[PDB]
Design an enzyme around this catalytic site. Structure first.
Site, PDB file in Angstrom:
ATOM      1  N   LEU A   1      -4.139  -5.687  -3.053  1.00  0.00           N
ATOM      2  CA  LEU A   1      -4.925  -5.346  -3.152  1.00  0.00           C
ATOM      3  C   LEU A   1      -5.343  -4.397  -3.843  1.00  0.00           C
ATOM      4  CD1 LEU A   1      -5.436  -3.741   0.690  1.00  0.00           C
ATOM      5  CD2 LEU A   1      -7.188  -5.386  -0.732  1.00  0.00           C
ATOM      6  N   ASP A   2      -6.176  -3.587  -3.884  1.00  0.00           N
ATOM      7  CA  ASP A   2      -6.945  -2.961  -5.739  1.00  0.00           C
ATOM      8  C   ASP A   2      -6.416  -1.711  -5.379  1.00  0.00           C
ATOM      9  OD1 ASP A   2      -7.236  -2.509  -8.516  1.00  0.00           O
ATOM     10  OD2 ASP A   2      -9.177  -3.643  -8.012  1.00  0.00           O
TER      11      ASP A   2
END
Ligand SMILES: CCCCCCCCCCCCCCCCCC(=O)OC[C@H](COP(=O)([O-])OCC[N+](C)(C)C)OC(=O)CCCCCCCCCCCCCCCCC
Lengths: 101, 50, 87, 70, 177, 459
Positions: free
Chosen positions: C41-42
Site C-alpha cells: 500500500l501507500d
C-alpha cells in the site's frame, strides 16, 4: 554543615485509620462520641428548635401589631365625625410661637 | 458532687439575675411617679413593681 | 443503548472494512498482514484506511497513534484498549 | 448480565451525619409541635375586651397567645 | 513541534496530517457521500501528481502553498466527532471517573458488601507494592546520564516483573463508568 | 447586662479546672447554654430601648450583634479544635481563655451607654486578636500581619479619643441617652471639619475603607480559623456600630462632608470585586469580598436614611454569617490539601458531595439570592442610594454582576471539572465539619422567615 539540628516534619494523621467510626472530635472514641452528642444536642435540639420557637412567639415585638390596632381605632374616630385623616402640622399651631420676620 | 464543674455557668447566671434584680431596686427614684404610668395604689399592694 | 463490543466483533468489522477496499484483494490479506510490505500500500492509502475505520467506529484516532498503526491486529488492539472491551 | 463495579466515594459518613442531624432535630421538634398544637386546641387564644372601670391589667395581659403571655 | 516521543514533525508527517485535515474539511463541505467521494478522488489526484518530487525545497514550497490553500477554503464549522476535543460529548463523563484510591477510604461496613472484589484489590495492591522497588531499580539502571532524552518508557525485559510505572495507566477509569 | 458578663467570666474557671481532655466539651456546652440564654435581649419596645443600669443598655441595634457573638463562640471552639490537637495542654487552655476574653470584651462593647467605655472596650478587643494572630498562625507573614493590623487601627483611634474627651468638656456628658436630647447642630468650620475627621477615621479604618483596607488581606490569610472568624464576622462591625452611634453628634456637617468617602467606597467596591475576579488565593478572595461588602455598609451609613440603616444592619449580620461560613469552608479545604492555592485542588464534587452542597449554598448566599437577608440588606441599601441619586444605581448594578462573576467562580475552580491526579489524601467529610457548616447556615436560612429582629433600632 548540618545547620539547625531539627526534628523532621511529621506526616499527616488520618483519624479514620485508627478508628473508622471517628466523628472528627478526638482520637479517643468515647470522648469523640460524647463530644458529638453534646454538640448535636445543645446545637440543634436546644438552641435552634427551642430558640426558633421562642423567636416565633415573641410578645408583640416593637409593638408592631399594636400600632396597627390603635390606628384601627383612630381612623374609626375621625371618619365618624368628619375630621381629616391626618393634619399637616404635627403639633398644634396655637401653642407654638414663631420669631418675627 | 462528681460533676461540680458543670454548675459554674448556671450559678453565675443565677447570680447575675439576682444582681440585676438587686440593681433594679436602687434605680427606683421615679417608681409610680412618671407622668405616663402614675396610678393610685390598688388594695393589698405597696409598690407598683420590684 | 450502546451495545457492548467484543474482540471478535471488532476484528470482524475491521476485516469487513478492509475487504470492502478495492486496492486490497480479499484472497491474500490476513489479520497479521502489514500494509506497506505484505500488501504493498501507500502512506495516503494508510491515511484512507485510518479515516475509514474512524468513520466506521464513530470515534477519531489521533495522528500520533494513526501513524504507528500499520496492521489489522494493531488496529484491533488499539480500538480494544480505547473502548475498554473484554471486561 | 456482566455487572461491573461502580467506583464512588464513601457516602457512609455523609449519610451518618444527615441521619444524626435529622434525629437530633426531630427529637425536640416533635414534642414542641405536639405541645403547641395541644395548647392551641385546648387552651386556645385570648379575646379582645375593653378594660373595665376600677381595674388595671397586668403587664402580660396585653398579649393574645398563651406562649407570648408566658 | 509538540510530540510525546519525538522532538519535531518530519516532512512526511506534515504532508499526511495536511491530507487528513483537508479530506476531513472536504467531507464537511459537501454533505452527501457521492459528491464527497468524487472530490476526494480529485484531491487524491492532486496529491498524487506531486508525489515523486525529489527537490526538497520545492516540496517545502508546495507544502506552504497547500497550507495556504487549505486555510483559504476551510469550513467555518467543520464536523467534529462527539468524543473528539471540541465535540458535543467531549469530556462529559469526567464527573463519573472516580479514582480507585477512594476505595481505600470506604467504611468497613460498606466494605463487607463486596468481599471478593476487595480481596482481589488487596492482591493487586500487594503485587504493586512488591513490584515497585524492582521496577524503580529497572528505571534507574536504564536511564542514561543526564536524565532520559525522550518520554518513551522501557518495557519489562525480565521474567516475572512488570513494566515500570504501570499502576495509574492500568487502573484508569473506563470511558463509560 | 450582668447576667451575661458573669457566665462569660466564669467560663475561664471552667476551662482551667477541667480535665485533661474535657476542655472542649465543657466549653462548647456552656457557651451554647450562654447562647441559648442570650435570646432574652429581644425585649424591645417600639419607642423605648432596653436600659439595664447606668452603664449598660441594649437597643435593637446592639442586640443582633450580641446574639451573633455569643452564638459564634461555640462555633469558634468547634472550628479551632483540629489544628490544635498537637498543641500543649497549657497552650490549649491559653487559646480558649483568649477566645473567652475576646468574646467578653465584644459583648461588653455593644452594650456600653458611655462612649468612653465603648471606646475602651473597642480598643481592648485589639490585644487578644493580635496575640492570636501572631502566636497561633501558620505562616511567617503573620508577624508582619501583626503590625499592619495594629498600627493602622490605633492611628485612627488615638485622635478620636481626644475628640471624645472634647465632648466631655463641651456637652458635659458622653452618655448616649443624654446626648440624644442635648445634641446641637454642627456649624461649618475647619474645627468641626477636623473633629468630624477625628470621630470618623477610626471607624473607616476598622470597617475598612478602600485605601485604608491594606491590613485586611494580610490579617485574614495568615490568621488561624478562629482569628479569621473573629475578624470577618464581628470585628468589622465595630466600625459600623461606632458610625451609627457617632453620626448623631455630627449633624448637619455630614451632608457635604461624606462626598469623598462615598466616592471612595463606590469605586472601591468595583475595584475589590475586580481584584476578586483575579485572586489566586481563596482566603484573599474572601477578604476582598469582605472589603467590598463593608464599603457598601459605609455608603449606607453615610447617606443616613432609615432604609439605608436597615439595609446596613441586615447586611452586617448576613455578611458576618456568610463570611464565617466561607472561611470555615476554606479552612476545611486547607486542612485537607495543606495549601491555599485555588487551582491546586479541583473537581471536589466527585469526592465530597455534601461539602459541594455546602459550597454551593454558601456561594448562593454570598451573591444575595432572595429571599435571604443578604438580598434584603443589599436591596434596601440600593433603594436608599437610588433615593440619594439616580446615577449611583449604575455603580451598584455593575458591581452585582462582578459579584456573580467571582462567587460562582470560587465555586467552579474548587468544585467542578476534572479532579487532579496527584492528590490522593482527600479524606471523607468529618461529622464535626458538617456540624459546623450546618450550624453556620441554618440560622442564616431561618432568619429569612423573621427578619424584623435584624432591621435596626428604627424598624
Ligand atoms: C439575630 C442575630 C444573630 C443571628 C444568629 C442567631 C443564632 C441563634 C439562632 C436561634 C434560633 C433561630 C432564631 C430565628 C428564628 C427565625 C424563624 C422564626 O421563628 O420565624 C418566626 C415566624 C413567625 O411567623 P409570623 O410572624 O408570620 O406569625 C405570627 C407570629 N405567631 C407565630 C406567634 C403566630 O415563623 C414562621 O413564619 C413559621 C411558619 C411555619 C413554618 C414554615 C412553613 C413553610 C416552610 C417552607 C415550605 C416550603 C416552601 C417552598 C420550598 C421549596 C424548596 C426550597
Amino acid at each position: 554543615t548540618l545547620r539547625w539540628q531539627e526534628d523532621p516534619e511529621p506526616e499527616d494523621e488520618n483519624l479514620y485509620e485508627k478508628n473508622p467510626d471517628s466523628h472528627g472530635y478526638d482520637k479517643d472514641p468515647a470522648v469523640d462520641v460524647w463530644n458529638m452528642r453534646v454538640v448535636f444536642f445543645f446545637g440543634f435540639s436546644i438552641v435552634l428548635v427551642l430558640g426558633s420557637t421562642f423567636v416565633a412567639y415573641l410578645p408583640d415585638y416593637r409593638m408592631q401589631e399594636w400600632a396597627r390596632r390603635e390606628a384601627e381605632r383612630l381612623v374609626k374616630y375621625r371618619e365618624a365625625h368628619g375630621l381629616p385623616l391626618m393634619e399637616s402640622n404635627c403639633f398644634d399651631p396655637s401653642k407654638i410661637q414663631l420669631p418675627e420676620d | 458532687r462528681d460533676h461540680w464543674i458543670h454548675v459554674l455557668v448556671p450559678v453565675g447566671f443565677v447570680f447575675g439575675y439576682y444582681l440585676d434584680r438587686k440593681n433594679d431596686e436602687k434605680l427606683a427614684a421615679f417608681r409610680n411617679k412618671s407622668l405616663l404610668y402614675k396610678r393610685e395604689l390598688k388594695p393589698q399592694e405597696e409598690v407598683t413593681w420590684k | 443503548d450502546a451495545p457492548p463490543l467484543t474482540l471478535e466483533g471488532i476484528k470482524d468489522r475491521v476485516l469487513y472494512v478492509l475487504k470492502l477496499y478495492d486496492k486490497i484483494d480479499p484472497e491474500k490479506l490476513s489479520v497479521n498482514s502489514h500494509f506497506m510490505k505484505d500488501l504493498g500500500l501507500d502512506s495516503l492509502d494508510q491515511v484512507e484506511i485510518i479515516m475509514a475505520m474512524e468513520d466506521e467506529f464513530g470515534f477519531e484516532i489521533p495522528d500520533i497513534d494513526a501513524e504507528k498503526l500499520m496492521c489489522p491486529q494493531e488496529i484491533v488492539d488499539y480500538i480494544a484498549d480505547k473502548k475498554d472491551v473484554y471486561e | 448480565g456482566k455487572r461491573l463495579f461502580i467506583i464512588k466515594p464513601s457516602g457512609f459518613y455523609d449519610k451518618r451525619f444527615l441521619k444524626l442531624l435529622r434525629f437530633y432535630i426531630l427529637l425536640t421538634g416533635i414534642p414542641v409541635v405536639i405541645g403547641i398544637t395541644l395548647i392551641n386546641v385546648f387552651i386556645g387564644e385570648a379575646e379582645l375586651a375593653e378594660i373595665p372601670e376600677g381595674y388595671v391589667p397586668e403587664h402580660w395581659e396585653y398579649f393574645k397567645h398563651p406562649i407570648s403571655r408566658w | 513541534a509538540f510530540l510525546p516521543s519525538a522532538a519535531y514533525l518530519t516532512h512526511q508527517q506534515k504532508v499526511l496530517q495536511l491530507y487528513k485535515r483537508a479530506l476531513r474539511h472536504l467531507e464537511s463541505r459537501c454533505v452527501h457521500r457521492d459528491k464527497y467521494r468524487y472530490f476526494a478522488c480529485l484531491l487524491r489526484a492532486r496529491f498524487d501528481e506531486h508525489k515523486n518530487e525529489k527537490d526538497m525545497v520545492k516540496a517545502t514550497q508546495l507544502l506552504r502553498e497547500a497550507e495556504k490553500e487549505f486555510w483559504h477554503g476551510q469550513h467555518p464549522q467543520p464536523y467534529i466527532f462527539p468524543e473528539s476535543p471540541g465535540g458535543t460529548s467531549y469530556e462529559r463523563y469526567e464527573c463519573y471517573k472516580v479514582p480507585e484510591w477512594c476505595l481505600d477510604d470506604w467504611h468497613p461496613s460498606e466494605k463487607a458488601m463486596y468481599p471478593d472484589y476487595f480481596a482481589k484489590r488487596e492482591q493487586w495492591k500487594k503485587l504493586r507494592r512488591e513490584s515497585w522497588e524492582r521496577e524503580v531499580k529497572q528505571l534507574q539502571e536504564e536511564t542514561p546520564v543526564g536524565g532520559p532524552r525522550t518520554e518513551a518508557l522501557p518495557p519489562a525485559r525480565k521474567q516475572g516483573d512488570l513494566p515500570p510505572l504501570w499502576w495509574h495507566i492500568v487502573t484508569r477509569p473506563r470511558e463509560r463508568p | 447586662m450582668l447576667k451575661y458578663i458573669i457566665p462569660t467570666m466564669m467560663l475561664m474557671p471552667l476551662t482551667w479546672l477541667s480535665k485533661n481532655s474535657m476542655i472542649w466539651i465543657n466549653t462548647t456546652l456552656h457557651s451554647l447554654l450562654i447562647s441559648l440564654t442570650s435570646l432574652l435581649l429581644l425585649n424591645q419596645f417600639g419607642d423605648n430601648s432596653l436600659n439595664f443600669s447606668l452603664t449598660f443598655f441594649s437597643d435593637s441595634l446592639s442586640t443582633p450583634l450580641l446574639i451573633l457573638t455569643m452564638w459564634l463562640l461555640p462555633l469558634m471552639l468547634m472550628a479551632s479544635q483540629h489544628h490544635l490537637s498537637k498543641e500543649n495542654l497549657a497552650r490549649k487552655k491559653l487559646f480558649i481563655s483568649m477566645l473567652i476574653l475576646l468574646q467578653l470584651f465584644l459583648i461588653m462593647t455593644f452594650t456600653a451607654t458611655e462612649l468612653i467605655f465603648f471606646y475602651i472596650m473597642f480598643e481592648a478587643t485589639l490585644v487578644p486578636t493580635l496575640i492570636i494572630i501572631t502566636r497561633w498562625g501558620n505562616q511567617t507573614e503573620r508577624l508582619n500581619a501583626g503590625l499592619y493590623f495594629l498600627f493602622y487601627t490605633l492611628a485612627g483611634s488615638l485622635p478620636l479619643l481626644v475628640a471624645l474627651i472634647y465632648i466631655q468638656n463641651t456637652m458635659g456628658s458622653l452618655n448616649f441617652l443624654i446626648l440624644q436630647y442635648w445634641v446641637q447642630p454642627m456649624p461649618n468650620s475647619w474645627s468641626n471639619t477636623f473633629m468630624w475627621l477625628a470621630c470618623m477615621m477610626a471607624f473607616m479604618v476598622k470597617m475598612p475603607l478602600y485605601g485604608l483596607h491594606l491590613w485586611l488581606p494580610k490579617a485574614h490569610v495568615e490568621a488561624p480559623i478562629a482569628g479569621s472568624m473573629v475578624l470577618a464576622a464581628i470585628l468589622l462591625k465595630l466600625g459600623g456600630y461606632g458610625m451609627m452611634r457617632i453620626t448623631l453628634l455630627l449633624n448637619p456637617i455630614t451632608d457635604f462632608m461624606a462626598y469623598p468617602f462615598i466616592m471612595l467606597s463606590l469605586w472601591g467596591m468595583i475595584m475589590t470585586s475586580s481584584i476578586c475576579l483575579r485572586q489566586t488565593d481563596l482566603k484573599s478572595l474572601i477578604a476582598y469580598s469582605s472589603v467590598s461588602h463593608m464599603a457598601l455598609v459605609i455608603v449606607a451609613i453615610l447617606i443616613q436614611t432609615p432604609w439605608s440603616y436597615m439595609g446596613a444592619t441586615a447586611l452586617m449580620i448576613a455578611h458576618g454569617l456568610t463570611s464565617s461560613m466561607l472561611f470555615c469552608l476554606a479552612n476545611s479545604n486547607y486542612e485537607r490539601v495543606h495549601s491555599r492555592t485555588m487551582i491546586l485542588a479541583r473537581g471536589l464534587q466527585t469526592l465530597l458531595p455534601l461539602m459541594a452542597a455546602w459550597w454551593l449554598l454558601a456561594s448562593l448566599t454570598n451573591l444575595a439570592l432572595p429571599p435571604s437577608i443578604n438580598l434584603i440588606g443589599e436591596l434596601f441599601v440600593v433603594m436608599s442610594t437610588f433615593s440619594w441619586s439616580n446615577i449611583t444605581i449604575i455603580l451598584m448594578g455593575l458591581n452585582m454582576v462582578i459579584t456573580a462573576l467571582y462567587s460562582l467562580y470560587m465555586l467552579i475552580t474548587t468544585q467542578r471539572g476534572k479532579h487532579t491526579h496527584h492528590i490522593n489524601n482527600i479524606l471523607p467529610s468529618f461529622t464535626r465539619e458538617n456540624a459546623l457548616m450546618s450550624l453556620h447556615m441554618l440560622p442564616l436560612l431561618l432568619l429569612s422567615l423573621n427578619p424584623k429582629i435584624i432591621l435596626g433600632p428604627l424598624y
